[PDB]
Ligand binder design. Sequence first.
Ligand SMILES: O=C(NCCN1CCOCC1)c1ccc2c(c1)C(=O)c1ccc(Nc3cc(NC(=O)c4cccs4)c(F)cc3F)cc1CC2
Length: 332
Amino acid sequence: RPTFYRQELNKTIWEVPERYQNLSPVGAYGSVCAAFDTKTGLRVAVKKLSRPFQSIIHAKRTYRELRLLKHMKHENVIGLLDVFTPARSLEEFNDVYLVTHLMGADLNNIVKCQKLTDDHVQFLIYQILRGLKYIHSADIIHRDLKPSNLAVNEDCELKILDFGLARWYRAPEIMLNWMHYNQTVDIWSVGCIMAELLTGRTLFPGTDHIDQLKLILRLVGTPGAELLKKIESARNYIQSLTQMPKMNFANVFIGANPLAVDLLEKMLVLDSDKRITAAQALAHAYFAQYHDPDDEPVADPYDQSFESRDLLIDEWKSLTYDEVISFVPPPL
Ligand SMILES: O=C(NCCN1CCOCC1)c1ccc2c(c1)C(=O)c1ccc(Nc3cc(NC(=O)c4cccs4)c(F)cc3F)cc1CC2
């Protein structure tokens, strides 16, 4: 059992093994510190979960997070190097820390509001879709996919952060509080991101809920009256926006690769029943230089029966504890 040390960073106490040195904040469900692991010689990210067992929602989410990370192994999914707690025993177990490879940037820090070239975008969105294909094939959704959830390293290798745990990138169906969501809620988010990297600008930077909905409804293809039927007097305020003469969608992305523009139109569709999926997006002509089906895996079957249990904080806590105790680091 390692020796721990305490310190206060950004008004929160970090208690970590001595192997982790030079804790330095880098900005959910936790705060993250960059650090240097003296035992492996790797630069690392350490995530401190915020109040992991101080509500049922948190307890179950903490367990979900540990389960997901011990199950997934994928290039575009963050890989758990260590998980630890200061606690000497179960009755003492109140904090969880997860260690991964430091990536060193999120996607906002790469796109400092400048257009990216087409190859740079293909590679970035390719990897996001590859990651989603894997994640989706485990019956898991991100639900809040945005640039701050995408870690990117100096070689442009990308990792999807914080998937499976749960406004500019959010599918409209979600902000309309539909109940029946499918996995394409994340493809909507992909379109928003993708668009943003092509133009330098956020596609729908709404300052509030109504603005956001209007910026979307007026730019994006208007559905058939059928779909405005699947929805109070919101139908009227919505119908009033969607009935108005539109601008050509592709004209927003003038000069972009026309295959890029075509894939966007398949992604930014309101009718989630007609949004392209991850797997289909990967087979778009846009990704011809990158697509390889022998290297776009699906996930191992993943036991999520815990999702339909309803337990108390201490039960969720015990099960997480067993997962911390039995964690085995990857070799290297
Ligand atoms: O190195 C960075 N520096 C920022 C600024 N520096 C400040 C110090 O001085 C120099 C400049 C930096 C800036 C931004 C980011 C990272 C690093 C990063 O590698 C990084 C790494 C990991 C991470 N989250 C994280 C998620 C998870 N978990 C998950 O993603 C998942 C949970 C469930 C399913 S996936 C985890 F276990 C451990 C984690 F650390 C979050 C980030 C945040 C993005």
